[PDB]
Amino acid sequence: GFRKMAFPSGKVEGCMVQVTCGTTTLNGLWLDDVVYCPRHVICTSEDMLNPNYEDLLIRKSNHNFLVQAGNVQLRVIGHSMQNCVLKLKVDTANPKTPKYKFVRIQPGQTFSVLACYNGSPSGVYQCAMRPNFTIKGSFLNGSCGSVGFNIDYDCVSFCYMHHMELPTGVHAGTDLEGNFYGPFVDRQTAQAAGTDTTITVNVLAWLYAAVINGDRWFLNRFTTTLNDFNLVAMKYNYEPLTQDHVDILGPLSAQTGIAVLDMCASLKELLQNGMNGRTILGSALLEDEFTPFDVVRQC
Amino acid sequence: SGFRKMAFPSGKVEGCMVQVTCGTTTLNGLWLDDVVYCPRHVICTSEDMLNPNYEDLLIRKSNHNFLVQAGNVQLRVIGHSMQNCVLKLKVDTANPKTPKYKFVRIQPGQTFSVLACYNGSPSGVYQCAMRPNFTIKGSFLNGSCGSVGFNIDYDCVSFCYMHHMELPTGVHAGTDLEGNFYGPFVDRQTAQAAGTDTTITVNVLAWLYAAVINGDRWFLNRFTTTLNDFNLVAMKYNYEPLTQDHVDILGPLSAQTGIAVLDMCASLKELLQNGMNGRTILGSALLEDEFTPFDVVRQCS
Numbered sequence: 001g002f003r004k005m006a007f008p009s010g011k012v013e014g015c016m017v018q019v020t021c022g023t024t025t026l027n028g029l030w031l032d033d034v035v036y037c038p039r040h041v042i043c044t045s046e047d048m049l050n051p052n053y054e055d056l057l058i059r060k061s062n063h064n065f066l067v068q069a070g071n072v073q074l075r076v077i078g079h080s081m082q083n084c085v086l087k088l089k090v091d092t093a094n095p096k097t098p099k100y101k102f103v104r105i106q107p108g109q110t111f112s113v114l115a116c117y118n119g120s121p122s123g124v125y126q127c128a129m130r131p132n133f134t135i136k137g138s139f140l141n142g143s144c145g146s147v148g149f150n151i152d153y154d155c156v157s158f159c160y161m162h163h164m165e166l167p168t169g170v171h172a173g174t175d176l177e178g179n180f181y182g183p184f185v186d187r188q189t190a191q192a193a194g195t196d197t198t199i200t201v202n203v204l205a206w207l208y209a210a211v212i213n214g215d216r217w218f219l220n221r222f223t224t225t226l227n228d229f230n231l232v233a234m235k236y237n238y239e240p241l242t243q244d245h246v247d248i249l250g251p252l253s254a255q256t257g258i259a260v261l262d263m264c265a266s267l268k269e270l271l272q273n274g275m276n277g278r279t280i281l282g283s284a285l286l287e288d289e290f291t292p293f294d295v296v297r298q299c
Numbered sequence: 300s301g302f303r304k305m306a307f308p309s310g311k312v313e314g315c316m317v318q319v320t321c322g323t324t325t326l327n328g329l330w331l332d333d334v335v336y337c338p339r340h341v342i343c344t345s346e347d348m349l350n351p352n353y354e355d356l357l358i359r360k361s362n363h364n365f366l367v368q369a370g371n372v373q374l375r376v377i378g379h380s381m382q383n384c385v386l387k388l389k390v391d392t393a394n395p396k397t398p399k400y401k402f403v404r405i406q407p408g409q410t411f412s413v414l415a416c417y418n419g420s421p422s423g424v425y426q427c428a429m430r431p432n433f434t435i436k437g438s439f440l441n442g443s444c445g446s447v448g449f450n451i452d453y454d455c456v457s458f459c460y461m462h463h464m465e466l467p468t469g470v471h472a473g474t475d476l477e478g479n480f481y482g483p484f485v486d487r488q489t490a491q492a493a494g495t496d497t498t499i500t501v502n503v504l505a506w507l508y509a510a511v512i513n514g515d516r517w518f519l520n521r522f523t524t525t526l527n528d529f530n531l532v533a534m535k536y537n538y539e540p541l542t543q544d545h546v547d548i549l550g551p552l553s554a555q556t557g558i559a560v561l562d563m564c565a566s567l568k569e570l571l572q573n574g575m576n577g578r579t580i581l582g583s584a585l586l587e588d589e590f591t592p593f594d595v596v597r598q599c600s
């Protein structure tokens with residue numbers, strides 16, 4: 001029984017609001033007395049192309065921003081910009097504010113996204129930050145400002161805010177301090193994500209999950225070196241494995257008795273020869289959106 | 300584009316999850332108004348699980364034998380009754396977080412979200428379909444009994460499933476909120492096995508139509524088929540047979556794309572014959588069967 005799960009979204013649902021600047025409406029995150037959203041909400045048709053946000057923001061007054069939490073309107077009483085995030089100070093602290101922190105994640109790490117439209121939560125999904133710094137998300141228009149998060153022991157770690165849809169059906173965004181993930185800019189310009197790769201450490205975690213779940217047909221008697229594994233992996237668009245990644249997998253090795261470079265030889269064989277009509281955890285394809293931590297928690 | 304499967308936001312259900320304990324057994328309960336619903340096997344001892352006589356066991360129990368906890372607050376049980384396989388515990392406090400709700404029974408192929416819980420605490424949420432063999436491929440979380448499945452429509456929560464047990468095949472079985480099991484299963488630890496599972500063909504076709512709407516058209520062919528010829532081939536791949544109701548349900552997607560249903564069926568037949576050839580459809584390397592026509596149509600105008 002191994003299904004991918006998102007975190008329960010209730011604590012985040014209590015924070016979603018609707019932000020409108022002129023004709024543009026998108027989602028905001030209401031924490032204490034501040035609403036956070038993408039700074040491009042201030043952009044206009046002319047602005048779109050090569051905007052100067054800061055010139056545009058200081059020339060915008062608080063009444064330009066319409067914030068709605070359900071049917072109750074929040075009055076913006078101050079506004080400031082931090083990198084690509086707009087911070088709107090409101091006259092009311094959110095009584096539903098959970099315990100939270102803003103964290104920055106790394107490519108390969110997983111989190112849940114609460115997809116919203118016009119400030120209303122629509123759905124939740126679990127994903128990983130791709131190695132090319134994009135997120136395979138949904139194509140729910142009007143979702144800019146939807147956030148990504150993890151929950152650790154009652155505390156919500158917000159790690160991502162959605163800013164734009166790339167042409168290839170992938171999304172790009174920032175952390176909650178407005179720093180972009182990846183080499184992207186918040187402007188309507190020709191932008192494309194680099195070629196994506198498979199998150200090797202997560203595939204290995206998933207193979208560890210399969211062994212713990214008694215799906216062991218792919219285990220072999222061989223081991224490989226990290227250099228030999230990396231040469232093969234990069235030819236198949238698998239991310240290179242670092243010593244840090246090997247260390248992260250340490251506890252799964254101790255739990256299963258399969259050394260990391262032993263499991264690497266299994267994965268190496270799987271790349272070069274495939275599954276030959278067999279499945280792992282019931283899937284014919286290798287999963288790379290489960291981290292080693294996700295496996296230890298679930299298993 | 301990339302259609303990512305999504306679960307409904309679980310907040311409205313999280314506010315209803317409680318912990319129900321009987322003797323040494325703790326599991327989840329659903330607190331709606333002044334009633335807590337949970338699997339009746341919370342009342343069985345280790346000696347009774349092969350052949351529990353629930354009526355015999357329930358009559359011997361009293362309100363004070365049940366420990367119901369909502370967070371750190373103990374709710375008082377003031378009544379109990381059994382409805383098929385669900386136990387209903389009347390409590391002295393109505394849940395103030397009770398959302399608008401309905402109990403509905405679903406059919407195989409229909410989708411819903413599950414809020415997986417442990418000890419009354421929500422742990423994770425996933426989206427799934429009820430398989431043609433009446434099981435759910437759920438998570439392996441321990442003591443998740445009593446976790447519920449639901450859909451949300453315009454702020455109304457429709458509860459359709461409650462988890463009761465894990466079958467030897469790793470799959471899960473449960474009931475609707477009236478305590479009727481989905482499929483030929485019983486709340487007994489006796490030898491029970493799920494029949495061979497099949498693919499939900501109507502959902503695959505809806506997903507292929509979604510791909511066409513998003514400009515993924517590599518798999519289309521110029522052939523059509525009869526419904527009978529399609530069903531004969533599909534069953535050879537353990538795909539469910541398509542009925543005229545399924546053809547009608549796909550009608551609007553056929554009209555939006557200009558591809559007759561039986562034309563799309565011929566393309567699916569080709570995919571079954573050929574395999575993906577390492578290609579992807581809507582960003583997935585596999586044929587997705589847990590997206591219903593209802594969900595496709597709403598999301599694509």
Ligand SMILES: CN(C)c1ccnc(N)c1
Pocket residue numbers: 081082083
């Ligand atoms: C880099 N920028 C714009 C910063 C850094 C730290 N704090 C604030 N508020 C803005």
